[PDB]
Enzyme design. Sequence first.
Site, PDB file in Angstrom:
ATOM      1  N   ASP H 174       6.278  30.088   9.166  1.00 46.49           N
ATOM      2  CA  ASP H 174       4.869  30.459   9.001  1.00 46.49           C
ATOM      3  C   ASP H 174       4.711  31.776   8.242  1.00 46.49           C
ATOM      4  OD1 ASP H 174       3.780  28.196  10.218  1.00 46.49           O
ATOM      5  OD2 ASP H 174       3.936  29.085  12.213  1.00 46.49           O
ATOM      6  N   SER H 175       5.208  31.790   7.013  1.00 44.92           N
ATOM      7  CA  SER H 175       4.922  32.867   6.083  1.00 44.92           C
ATOM      8  C   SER H 175       4.793  32.248   4.702  1.00 44.92           C
ATOM      9  CB  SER H 175       5.988  33.960   6.115  1.00 44.92           C
ATOM     10  OG  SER H 175       7.202  33.483   5.599  1.00 44.92           O
TER      11      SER H 175
END
Lengths: 56, 46, 115, 258, 52, 48, 67, 427, 47, 528
Positions: H174-175
Amino acid sequence: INGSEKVLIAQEKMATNTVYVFAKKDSKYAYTGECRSCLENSSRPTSTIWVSMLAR
Amino acid sequence: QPMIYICGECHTENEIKSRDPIRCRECGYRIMYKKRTKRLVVFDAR
Amino acid sequence: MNAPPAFESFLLFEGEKKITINKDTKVPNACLFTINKEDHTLGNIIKSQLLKDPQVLFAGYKVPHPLEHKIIIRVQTTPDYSPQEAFTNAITDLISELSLLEERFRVAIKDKQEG
Amino acid sequence: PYANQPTVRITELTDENVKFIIENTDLAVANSIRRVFIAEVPIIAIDWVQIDANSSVLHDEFIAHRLGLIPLTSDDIVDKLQYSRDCTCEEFCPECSVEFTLDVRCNEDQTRHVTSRDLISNSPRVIPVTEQDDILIVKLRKGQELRLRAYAKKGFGKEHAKWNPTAGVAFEYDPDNALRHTVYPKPEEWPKSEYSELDEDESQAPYDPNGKPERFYYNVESCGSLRPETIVLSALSGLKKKLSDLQTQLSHEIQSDV
Amino acid sequence: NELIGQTVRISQGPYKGYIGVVKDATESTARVELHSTCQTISVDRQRLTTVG
Amino acid sequence: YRHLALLCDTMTCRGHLMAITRHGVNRQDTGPLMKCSFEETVDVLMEA
Amino acid sequence: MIIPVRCFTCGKIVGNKWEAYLGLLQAEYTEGDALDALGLKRYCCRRMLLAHVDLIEKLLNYAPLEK
Amino acid sequence: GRICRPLLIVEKQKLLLKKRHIDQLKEREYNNYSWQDLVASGVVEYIDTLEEETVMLAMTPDDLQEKEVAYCSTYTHCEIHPSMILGVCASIIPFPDHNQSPRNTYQSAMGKQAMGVYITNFHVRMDTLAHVLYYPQKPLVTTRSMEYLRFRELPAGINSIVAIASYTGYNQEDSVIMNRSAVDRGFFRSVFYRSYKEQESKKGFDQEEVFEKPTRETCQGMRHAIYDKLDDDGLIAPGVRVSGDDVIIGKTVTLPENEDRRYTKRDCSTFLRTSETGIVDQVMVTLNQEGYKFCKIRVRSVRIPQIGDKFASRHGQKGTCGIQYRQEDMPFTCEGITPDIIINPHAIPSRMTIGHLIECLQGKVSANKGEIGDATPFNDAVNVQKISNLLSDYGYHLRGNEVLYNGFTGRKITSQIFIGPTYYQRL
Amino acid sequence: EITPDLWQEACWIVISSYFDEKGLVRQQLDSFDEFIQMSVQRIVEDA
Amino acid sequence: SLKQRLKGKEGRVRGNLMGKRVDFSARTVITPDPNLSIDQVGVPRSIAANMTFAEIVTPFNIDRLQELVRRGNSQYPGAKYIIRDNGDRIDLRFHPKPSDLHLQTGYKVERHMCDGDIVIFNRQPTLHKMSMMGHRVRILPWSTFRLNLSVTTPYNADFDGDEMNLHLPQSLETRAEIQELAMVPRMIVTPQSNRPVMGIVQDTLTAVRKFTKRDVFLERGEVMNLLMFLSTWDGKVPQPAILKPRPLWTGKQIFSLIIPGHINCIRTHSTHPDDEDSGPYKHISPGDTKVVVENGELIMGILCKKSLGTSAGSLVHISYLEMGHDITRLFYSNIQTVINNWLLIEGHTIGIGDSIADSKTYQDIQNTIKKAKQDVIEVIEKAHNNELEPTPGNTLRQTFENQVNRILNDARDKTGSSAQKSLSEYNNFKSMVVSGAKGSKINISQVIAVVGQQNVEGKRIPFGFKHRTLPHFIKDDYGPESRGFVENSYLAGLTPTEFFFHAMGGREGLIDTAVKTAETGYIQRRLI
Ligand SMILES: [Mg+2]
Ligand SMILES: [Zn+2]
Ligand SMILES: [Zn+2]
Ligand SMILES: [Zn+2]
């Protein structure tokens, strides 16, 4: 209010003047009725009467 | 020595004093806006 | 705040060598070339040109980290043939074909603009 | 053991783009010429903005930002300018910078568009690129104004993206993937490239193991700051200069070791 | 110190041209507070030039 | 199994079920500072 | 707010296109016809005008504080 | 206090919303035919929740008044549009029926946190913590209901060419990988305003605040900071750079034991909030409710997107910036188009935001066709096969995949990267 | 007559007419409006 | 009162004596970085220029520390306090005269922390002992804690705005203590379930599963690019698996260059057929689904999460036990670096092409939904006519609900299997599920085929209205669509009643997640 912008969040409540029948299965009552009775345009608050059948 | 403030709604400018109540002369509007500084600014255009 | 300034990609400083040669000790005839303040836009061409020698046994490059501006080009050449010689021939071969390419591009412009 | 001889074939040349084909070179040379189109070509762009006065609805750093990204005609001056941090001047001079002046007050009930035309140079060659309309910097109500002095300096695309001369650099090799670098799951669904030469019955070319990437197709569209061919000439000169300075440092280090 | 508070223009090196104000002065390297970006940098005092 | 065996052995190393509350931990002789480190703090110190 | 000077992906100068885009909309073209009449082939340059909201015209209604 | 909602009214098996109501209702501001005239016409009516227990409610008229193997054929009311069951934050989600419902809840949380132009008169307002954005855009993939929240007039976020690619490994868990050249062209470059209020207090002569430039020899307890940034009245003039622990308001309170020697009134100054910096935007000077002098200072700091900055889609697909590559390092199509964001492919299959993919596909169709595409939830005139057939005509792959070339080596990537424009929100 | 298959554009006309007539905050405004118009007088007379 | 000052969770015992505010600690957001080892954290400069280590002046470091004091404070690597022999502090941020900046042996110098310093890194809530581990400092430019990818799994830290706490050990003795106890190589194998906690996270795991397949071949230049990233490579390019026509390396050879020492393991890939080890080919696997690492070299098999993950007996657990623990740190770093740099050549995506089955599969799905829906309706018409007979042990209604739930679960399972027979081996959903990196077969079935029965409290959608679930349904409607079965998929999208029933199931999940936290934390507190 003092330069601060305030929002009155709408608060839920049980509907007044309406008979409800609930079951306190943990208490000594089999079926308990209630009526949160509150007259419109009356300065006094609501006053709940309960009508409850005993469990035996 | 006086500070020049811009008179809010009036958009005109006026002097002010230390310990002076904040009032416009045109319509007595209470909100003054201080003028932009006279020293230099420099921005990297990044 | 902690933003590195934009000239950290390509400007060196006092006490920074542009190129650093470190002789590898694991295998014979191998060197690590540490190029400071460069990226893939140098080491990729040098790697592809060093693969064209028949005498380079290993030609690679890596960035250690993409936030720190340095590459390492590892060269292992055949014995009797120094990897520094392969590197300084790769640079001359690139300058050769790029100057030839620039001259042919000039001639193609003169062809196109003059019909 | 040596460099192959590349060759250039230009398919079109317009004032916006240049479209050409480089044959008989490696892939990394070709990718690097693309990356030097994007980054290592130096142009002239505004980098020092001194806001004398501002009353516009956009704040100061927004206006200095928008003055950054305006392309300037730098077709022949950028080879003459020194980098600003390299010059021996008293911190600005006409050898490393181009002065611009903007002085606009709106004295009318119409919304007055401070455009790129209001940037006034002292150098007649370095002017903003804007047939086409001008680049809108800031709109003004009556009463508002802005005065500023802006120095432009030489720099390239690694430093900041306002020194990027290219609008778009399309680059493709092997448009029918005879090399099979990309592997389509169902190649019937895939549209053919502009440079495909297969008939509409055939989807992709047959594989050859002995092939290698060659015949690189480029489409270099300039933003207007340079002519699209002097982007390519300046890129080749800059890549040869980077390699020559790397060779000079290499010679110093080898002489230091021996 | 006498220098602290002045507005200086970096006259040499990679930061050339940036306007700033000195937070701290030293015998050697002053700390200039950059007006262009949000950051404070240490610069040799030979580079700085006072503006007005 | 080390962890299950240790937990089941500390609950039964007193002879009866040592419930993990104040009601079972704060009934063994461990120390007033140890017992006031758990949920009832002043009452343990007042009793000690 | 105001139109970006460059397309974010390409760097194509799109800041000079906005008033002509409004002219081609009010001259009864479709938006897709107006974009490639302005000559925006790549869709990343087409989103820069197709999905701009010209908010500065709202900001110019207010009288300027300094005068 | 009861809670109702309007529904159409269905006589025998027919709506009462006839064509003449639409004809009189299209021509508003002319006929003065409002909603209230349609409530008066006996066509719609408000039904509350008790009465919903005794109503037979058609979902849509195109299915539920036509004769079939009949379900009930005793409808009383018809729903106006099903998309009106959603709130104000769940209305800005494109295709929210294609998502999973925790993802819709998480976007409803994040949509309240997106930066954007929060109000039109933000230059007058002395709000504390104003987050506004440079170049906000309306979504290319929009709903019909955004027209009524006026989300196309004060938007929050920028349309960005995302690609969904595994890459160097900075879009891992989740980046997202961002484009440094795009960010240098003003992409999500925001601006954060913060105001600072302070008044003085006329009291019973023992302590008396007053705005003035405090002097080292005169004032006591004066903290070591720069006081020459102040003007003659103890305030900052606008357009002055301040940083952490710079003074912004020079205020001194008097000391009752100045006679009870040589050392007088103590510093009571508000500093700029430490580990922050920026230019003073504007300063207002006025009187309070009590008649005392009272100053507010709004301090401006632009916020260029760097790593750690938290971005989010319109689907609960948040993530910080992992790294920023320049344009020459970012991958690119057969044309010159690089991504602006590169998101993780592993963010999709367990979270199950297929609506993100459909927003991306409809975004390619929308940006190529030259129209702001429609993403109302319950439509049936837009499924993914019609989107794919519309995309195929503009010379793309059916399903939005496009051959990216690598940005470092130049060798074209073996997989075919899904790419196209979505609508990202900076939080 | 009726709206056979142009219903998809005919319903958003009536949604637009609703939100142009009412708006998004009729609850707050109409509630305070009925308060200060009727209910304050009812409190004053019911004391 | 005093008893109220002491009795609370915010009191003196728990609030100040047990858990107290500490100096020398930083808190910022984490963002990933795969280019640094598993025991390295990349801290910012402005954190490192504010947290100091008290280094003792000895004649070995007196010139270095002398130079850092000459730099003073804010010339980043320098120092701010210099502590005398009698405990007198001298500032370096206020620029004293140069006569007392001398150093003799015995002074302390509180210097800004550099590369190689040891820090403690944790995440609230700290559940177990691998939620608080020791890293080595690397100074990277931007303002986040760059930490590695495989340390996400013990921390449970998913970089979406997570911020971590960083403590600095001030004494040299506690620095050696953290180095000898709480290093992340010394906390690879957990005591709770005698298996590793690190494993190989998602994108490295799919790229290593695609990497180690049988049909992966590498050109000489791509091999030399990959071998540049092995830290443990002895400089010898291996002999190719294909010498002629072209020198062409298989990816298992590069992975054998990764695998350290001489370790020997036999594992099975996630899609290994269970009827393969029965008949022939049990040693020559036709699907390449039998992992054999042997004499430190990957003989065969594809490495899913059952080979490299946190399962016990995996390749990393045996690399911990047979080889050292520094060697396993190297093994994790080498896998991450070289498989990410192959993944640049390969590339991995997910798309809307990966969510669409061909029309024969959609016809199969719709035929199965229609058959099961007609079956539920005929069970209903048996139930109305009292022809349904009750199962022994429950009522006729619970018998009916068992029949309806059994038919609908059979429909969900049959449509789920008939969806997942149609991925054609390039579908990226299958790429992430087969590697086990992210997702499962249920997510594929719900995206492609059918969402399935929505539940509230383990049964169907209850009758909230009078004897109907929504006012669009007729009263006493026990059918599939009335009671919460969703027959659409996330590719097609849900109808508004199915949207609302799906929102009910999701609200039940979020209520579970939000109510679980306090009770589980209190159970942990009582147990400790
Ligand atoms: Mg998190
Ligand atoms: Zn006035
Ligand atoms: Zn100069
Ligand atoms: Zn573009």
